[model samples]
Target chain A: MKTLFLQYPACSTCQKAKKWLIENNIEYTNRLIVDDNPTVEELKAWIPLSGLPVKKFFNTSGVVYKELKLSSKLPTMTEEEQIALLATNGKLVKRPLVVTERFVLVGFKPEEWEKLK
Target chain B: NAMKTLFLQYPACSTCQKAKKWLIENNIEYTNRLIVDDNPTVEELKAWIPLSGLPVKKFFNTSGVVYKELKLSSKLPTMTEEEQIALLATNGKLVKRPLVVTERFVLVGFKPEEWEKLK
Candidate 1:
C-alpha cells in the first residue's frame, strides 16, 4: 500500500514506527516533518482522507502549545482560529502522522500501524 | 506552586529551534517536552488558559491537517469555554506549543518582545 510517513527522525517513537513499517514491508515514503510543515492546501487535502479532526494534526503537548494555552479553550474555538494557529507553526502538529489514500493515522502506535500495514 | 516552564516541541521544528536558541542564549532555563508521546491530560490543558492570558484563538494551531479535516477553521471563537476545553482535551494535537506554565502566568510560543516584558 502507498503510504506517507511524516515524522521527526530524532523521535524514538517515530523510530519505532519506522522499524515497524520496514519489518512489515509497508511501502512508504518518509518525509521530515521539520522540513515539510503542512500547508493549508495540503491540510485541506489530508483532512478527509485521514478521518480525524483538524485538531489531530497539531502537536498539543509541545512547549509552544502550553505557551498558547490551547488546552483550556480548544472546544470553544472556531475552525478558522484553529487552522490559522496550526498553520503558523510546525511545532503545533502531532508527530509521525501516517497518511494513506483513505486514512490518516496519528502518532506512532504499533497496533494501529500494524493494522494499516 | 513553584514556577515551571514547559516547552512543547516537535523534535526539529525550525521555529521551535529558533525559540530554544533564543531562550538558551538569554539563559532562560526550561524543560523541553514533547507534545504527542507525552500528551498532557485534559484537566492540565484546561488549567493553563487564563494563566497565559492570550486570546483563545492564539492557542490554536490552524494549519494542521487534522484541523482542516475537522473543519474547525470557522467555529472556535464562538464556542463556549467548556466546549472548547472539552474538544481540546480529547486530542492533545489540538493545542498550541511552548505552553509555559508559571505560577501566575502562561505564555505560548516565543515572541521576543513579550518575553522581554516578562523579565
Candidate 2:
C-alpha cells in the first residue's frame, strides 16, 4: 500500500503538509481522520513501526486532551490504554499523520516528512 | 517536581534528529527552540556553562565549518570566557546543536549516556 496521509482537511498544519506532499510530487491517500479515525489495532501496529513513543501520537493541544487531563494521566497508563483512548476521537490524535509500510510519522515536521519520499 | 527543559536544535542536523528521537522515546518534555532563529544570550550561556560542568571551549562547535572559517581554534585562546560567550551569541552556527538546558543542568552536544539522567 502507498502512503496514507491521515488528516483533518481544515487543519492548517494538515494543509501545509499536504502542500509539501503536492510540491514534492508525492502521492498518498487522503484519510480524513476526524471522520475516519484510526482504530486501536492500527495504532498498535503503526506506533511501533515509527520508533517514537506512544506519547508523541497524542494531540496535546486539543480539547479532548485537556478535558481528559492526559498529561498527568499518561504516565500511569499503558501503551494499549493510551492507544484505545486515542481511538475514541480523531481530534485526540496528532494531525497530518503520515503512515506507510516503512514508517509512521506524527505531526508535520518538514525533515521527517521529507524523509518520506 | 519535573524538570523544566529547553531544547535548542536545528531540525535538519543529523545529530539533532537522533537526539530529538531519543528525547521523544524517553518522554522528556522540553521547550523546543530553533537555535538559528533564537540564538542563546551571553547571560544564558554563562548560567548554562556552570551548570553543565563543561569547559567554555566545549560549548563551541569545534567540528563545524563556522569554527574553521573563523579560525577559532588558534584564535580562541586569545579571547576571555566573556568574549567566547559573546561570539557564540552572535550566531547559532557558532554554538553546538542539540543543546539541553534544564533547571538542574545544561548539556552541550548529544551525549548518549550523559542525557539519560534527564529522562
Candidate 3:
C-alpha cells in the first residue's frame, strides 16, 4: 500500500523525512497539509489506526494549542467535540502524519518510520 | 537593536528542545519565552509575518493537531487575512514552533541551514 504522507512543504523536518523516504525507496503519495487539511472523519479513522490516544495526534507545542488553552479544555471535551475541533483546522494536527493500511505514524522519527517497512 | 532576540518555544516539544540546544551551542544570546504560556496576539503575528517574508500560512503549525482537528486547510481559504491572523492568535499551538525573532528578522520555524544566515 502506498503511504499517505501529509506534510507542510516549508517544514524542515518534513523535508528531511522526504529525503529519507526517497533514499529508502518508500512508495508514497504527498499531500500538502495547508492546502488540504484532513477532515474530522479522517482523523477519527486515523487516530484508531495510529494505536495511540487521540491526544497524541495534536501539535502540543504550537501557538494555537496554548492560545486556545486546549490543555485545560481538551480533557472536558467529549470525543465527538474533540473530533469536531480537530476537523476545524489542519494546522492543529501533528505531522508528518503517515497513514498506511497497516498502521499510522505521527511525526518524523526515523526509527518509528522504519517500522512501516 | 541591542535587545536579545526572543526565542518563543514550548518546553515539551522536541523541535523546540533541539532549537534551544542549538542556540546554546552556538552561543546565541536570546530570551526564552514559552509560546504556550504567552501566546502571541494577532497584532504581534501580523507584525512578524510580514517581517519574516513568508506566506501567512507559513506561520501556522500546519502539523499541529488543532489544525487537523479544525480542518483549517479548507476553512482558511474563505477567511480574510485578518480573520486568519486572529485565528492563529487564538491558540499558540496553531502557530509554528520555535519562532526566532530579532530586531531585523523573524523566522517561523527552525532550520539549521536557514538559521546560519542569522549571523
Candidate 4:
C-alpha cells in the first residue's frame, strides 16, 4: 500500500517523517494539509482508528486554535458543531496526515515508525 | 487530501500514553509529539482555537492539577487571548494531552466511545 503523508512543507517534523519514509524505501504521496484539506468521510473513517472525536482531529495549539477560542467552549459544543468548525479552517487542523487502507496516521514519530511492522 | 489527526501529548502523562496505545491498537497511524518541549506559540494556538470554535475553553486541560492551582476555571471567562497564550506557553501541564485533529474533527482528552465509533 502507498502511504499518504499529509503535511505542511514548512513543518520540521513533517520533513523528518518524509525523510524517514524515503530512507526506509517506503513509498508515499505528499499532501499539504492546509492547502488540500480532507473531507468529512475521510475524517470519519479515521475516528475509530484514531480512537477520538472530530475535535481530536484538530491541532488545538495552532494559532487559529486559540484565535477561535475553541478551548473554552468545545466541551459543550455538539460533535457536528466541532466538525463544521474544523471543516472551515485547514490551518486549524494538524499537519502531515498519513493515511492508508486499514490505517491512518496524523503526525510524525521517528522511533515508533521505525518499529512499525 | 486524506484525513489526519495531530495529537498534542505530553510524554510523561499516563492519559497521553493510553491515548497513544488506543490509536495504535486500532491501527490508526499518527504522529505523536510533545507539546511543552515543542511548544506551540500564541499565534499557532490562535489559528487552532477557531477550528474547535469559540468559547476558548476547549483548548485547555481543565482537569489537570495545574488548572486548579492557577484557578483557571474561575479566570477563563475574563482571560484575554494574550493571557491565555502566555499561560499555555508557560507550562505544559496546563495544556491538555493528546489533542487529536482530523479534517472535520477536533477532539481533546481521551474519549473512548467517540474514537471507537469513528473506527
Off by over 4 Å in 4: A114-116, B1-119
Deviation in Å, model 3, residue A33 alpha carbon = 32
Tens-digit lDDT track of model 4 for B52-87: 533355568887888998898888755655566667
- Best model per lDDT: 2
Model 1 alpha-carbon miss at residue A65, Å: 0.6
Report the CA-based lDDT of candidate 4 relative to the real structure.
0.70
Q: At residue B11, what lDDT does model 1 achieve? A: 56
Better of 1 and 2 by DockQ: 1
Off by over 4 Å in 3: A1-117
Judging by lDDT, tell me the better candidate of 3 and 4. Answer: 3
TM-score of each: 0.49, 0.51, 0.49, 0.47
Separate DockQ for every predicted complex: 0.15, 0.01, 0.02, 0.02
Total residue pair clashes for candidate 3: 45
For residue A36, model 3's alpha carbon misses the true position, in angstroms, by: 32
Q: Residue A62 of candidate 1: its Cα lDDT?
A: 83
Segments in model 1 whose C-alpha atoms lie over 4 Å from true places: B1-119
Per-residue lDDT for A63-98 in model 4, tens only?
877886877766555555666677776787766667
At residue B39, give the lDDT of candidate 3.
95
lDDT of 2 by residue, A43-97 (tens): 9899877766576788988998899898877645655577888999899999989
Compute the lDDT for candidate 1: 0.70
Tens digit of per-residue lDDT, candidate 1, span A1-117: 657898887888789888888888888888887688877776777766654555666786788778878776555566557777777766777888888877778888676676584
